[PDB]
Design a protein around this ligand. Structure first.
Ligand SMILES: Cc1ncc(C[n+]2csc(CCOP(=O)(O)OP(=O)(O)O)c2C)c(N)n1
Ligand SMILES: Cc1ncc(C[n+]2csc(CCOP(=O)(O)OP(=O)(O)O)c2C)c(N)n1
Ligand SMILES: CCCCCCCCO[C@@H]1[C@@H](O)[C@H](O)[C@@H](CO)O[C@H]1O
Ligand SMILES: CCCCCCCCO[C@@H]1[C@@H](O)[C@H](O)[C@@H](CO)O[C@H]1O
Ligand SMILES: CCCCCCCCO[C@@H]1[C@@H](O)[C@H](O)[C@@H](CO)O[C@H]1O
Ligand SMILES: CCCCCCCCO[C@@H]1[C@@H](O)[C@H](O)[C@@H](CO)O[C@H]1O
Ligand SMILES: CCCCCCCCO[C@@H]1[C@@H](O)[C@H](O)[C@@H](CO)O[C@H]1O
Ligand SMILES: CCCCCCCCO[C@@H]1[C@@H](O)[C@H](O)[C@@H](CO)O[C@H]1O
Ligand SMILES: CCCCCCCCO[C@@H]1[C@@H](O)[C@H](O)[C@@H](CO)O[C@H]1O
Ligand SMILES: CCCCCCCCO[C@@H]1[C@@H](O)[C@H](O)[C@@H](CO)O[C@H]1O
Ligand SMILES: CCCCCCCCO[C@@H]1[C@@H](O)[C@H](O)[C@@H](CO)O[C@H]1O
Ligand SMILES: CCCCCCCCO[C@@H]1[C@@H](O)[C@H](O)[C@@H](CO)O[C@H]1O
Ligand SMILES: CCCCCCCCO[C@@H]1[C@@H](O)[C@H](O)[C@@H](CO)O[C@H]1O
Ligand SMILES: CCCCCCCCO[C@@H]1[C@@H](O)[C@H](O)[C@@H](CO)O[C@H]1O
Ligand SMILES: CCCCCCCCO[C@@H]1[C@@H](O)[C@H](O)[C@@H](CO)O[C@H]1O
Ligand SMILES: CCCCCCCCO[C@@H]1[C@@H](O)[C@H](O)[C@@H](CO)O[C@H]1O
Ligand SMILES: CCCCCCCCO[C@@H]1[C@@H](O)[C@H](O)[C@@H](CO)O[C@H]1O
Lengths: 183, 186
């Protein structure tokens, strides 16, 4: 029953996220808007912290199976497609608050809590992308840029752009489809 | 080779992950739901020595090594994922107070260094055993005592396992801060 259902929902939203990953919003190899965070955000709100991590990791592991995983070195694939996607769990730190306000028709308060949990969950993921950027992606930097500088700026931009476009759509989905976040 | 700081830190993570995997072959278990993980001792050293991200990388390496060495108890593909990848990745939080420990240890403030160390060891331990508790509820409900639900059995057993692990590992680390300060100070 419930155990199978919650696990399946994680797998479904992971699959949807993997599908959205085939929609390229990239500028080079260091900037990209991850539309797959949209299914991650709803499942994080709908089910909570642990579910967002499991679903997130499934999404990361699906990169390997679908061949969408950039692999410079074995270490870097471990950090970027497993560690980083596991910390999507933090997208559900305010899931109870969002669901609480959403069910009580406090949509404004629900959206505000939603942006709080989408930013934390976003930064939590891209932290590991920033780490791997310094360790592995130095040779892709601009002319005269260090590995750390190139990593914080590019991963910061990717994080900023990703949370922004996903946050807006989530906000609309909170307005248009409340039951999607309320199981 | 020793001038490449990035390669060294990665190697150190691999080394401590290997040492933790060896300690995982030391059975301090009572049944299948209680165990004192001695492998958290090297995980705590590297966490203090190198910080948050290194602890998570080393922890995950330790977690993955369970598959290669056949030490992973796999009930379902989804629980193996949660317990040997998610749980071991959250050992990163063993390094939330790494700077404080090293800062006090270098200033010869041993008492304060140990106090921060215990804080960073408790948080890191809880961060890992959270996922063991989650999997305990989701999967390990059939190994419970008679009359015990999945929730009850998981919070008590994983709580005790976490308690026993943090206590034993914490004391060993506390002594190593006294006897071997340079081990935590790169
Ligand atoms: C400076 C820098 N450049 C490039 C990378 C590589 N990188 C950034 S995000 C990422 C994860 C995949 O990104 P994306 O194309 O958004 O995958 P999605 O989640 O959308 O499926 C990787 C491998 C990095 N970690 N750091
Ligand atoms: C109630 C419950 N019982 C059993 C488990 C299974 N379990 C607990 S901790 C753990 C990780 C391995 O722990 P340990 O036995 O200490 O191995 P080691 O740390 O030495 O590698 C697993 C698979 C669980 N998650 N929940
Ligand atoms: C919106 C912000 C867009 C910024 C464009 C950055 O463009 C860089 C390139 O300059 C770089 O050469 C390759 C890797 O070699 O990766 C890209 O991210
Ligand atoms: C590191 C450990 C992370 C733990 C934070 C999990 O956070 C959960 C929420 O996701 C959940 O919605 C509520 C439900 O009552 O309870 C909390 O414990
Ligand atoms: C279509 C999307 C509209 C934008 C929605 C986000 C604007 C609301 O912004 C709120 C703040 O007003 C509030 O003070 C803090 C509290 O921590 O959290 C934010 O989400
Ligand atoms: C990202 C930065 C921190 C996010 C958490 C903010 O949390 C705020 C609360 O502090 C505030 O009281 C309520 C309003 O009732 O809304 C939340 O968003
Ligand atoms: C959202 C963030 C956008 C950041 C864009 C930064 C553009 C970098 O632009 C760099 C310069 O900084 C550098 O000095 C010269 C050297 O030949 O080459 C360029 O590519
Ligand atoms: C669509 C782009 C805008 C939505 C994102 C805004 C992020 C939340 O920003 C809020 C602020 O609005 C607020 O003033 C302070 C006060 O504690 O805390 C922040 O979290
Ligand atoms: C204060 C006591 C801490 C816990 C001690 C754990 C004892 C470890 O020793 C156990 C044995 O007690 C057990 O019989 C076999 C097989 O089940 O495996 C061993 O690991
Ligand atoms: C002394 C430290 C705390 C341990 C107290 C209880 C240990 C026994 O707990 C066992 C479990 O470990 C075992 O997996 C299941 C199997 O069905 O049955 C229980 O009796
Ligand atoms: C050999 C075993 C030594 C055990 C030493 C335990 C020290 C506990 O350390 C605590 C800290 O964890 C706590 O945060 C602060 C708060 O003010 O106070 C200390 O006593
Ligand atoms: C083996 C001994 C382990 C000791 C670990 C202690 C960790 C908790 O540390 C607590 C603090 O968190 C608390 O603020 C103060 C207040 O009185 O007291 C300490 O014992
Ligand atoms: C478990 C809870 C961990 C809490 C850690 C914060 O506690 C710190 C101590 O670790 C520290 O020794 C003293 C020094 O001024 O101040 C406290 O705030
Ligand atoms: C050893 C570490 C123990 C951690 C226990 C976590 C305490 C919170 O417990 C809640 C549960 O009560 C709840 O069923 C779900 C979320 O709705 O998961 C946890 O977050
Ligand atoms: C060190 C390891 C300590 C593990 C036991 C923590 O115990 C807590 C309780 O104190 C708390 O009241 C409930 C609330 O959901 O959840 C448990 O996880
Ligand atoms: C920290 C160590 C905790 C160990 C707890 C062990 C609980 C024992 O479990 C008993 C069962 O063995 C007994 O058969 C039934 C009776 O119907 O009730 C339980 O309390
Ligand atoms: C690893 C876990 C170690 C066991 C718990 C350590 C106890 C610290 O907990 C302290 C107590 O010692 C203190 O008496 C009161 C404050 O009035 O509450 C806590 O702050």
């Amino acid at each position: 029953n419930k155990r199978l259902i919650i696990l399946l929902e994680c797998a479904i939203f992971a699959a949807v996220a993997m599908v959205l990953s085939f929609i390229p919003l990239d500028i080079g190899s260091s900037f990209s808007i991850s539309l797959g965070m949209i299914p991650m955000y709803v499942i994080a709100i709908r089910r909570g912290f642990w579910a967002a991590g499991f679903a997130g990791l499934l999404w990361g592991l699906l990169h390997f199976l679908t061949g969408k995983a950039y692999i410079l070195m074995p270490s870097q694939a471990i950090i970027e497609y497993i560690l980083a996607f596991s910390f999507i769990a933090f997208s559900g730190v305010f899931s109870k608050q969002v669901r609480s306000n959403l069910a009580a028709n406090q949509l404004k308060k629900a959206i505000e809590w939603a942006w709080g949990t989408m930013i934390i969950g976003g930064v939590a993921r891209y932290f590991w992308h920033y780490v791997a950027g310094v360790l592995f992606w130095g040779a892709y930097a601009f002319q005269g840029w260090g590995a750390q500088l190139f990593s914080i700026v590019m991963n910061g931009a990717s994080c900023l752009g990703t949370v922004l476009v996903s946050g807006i759509i989530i906000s609309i989905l909170l307005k248009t489809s409340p039951k999607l976040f309320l199981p």
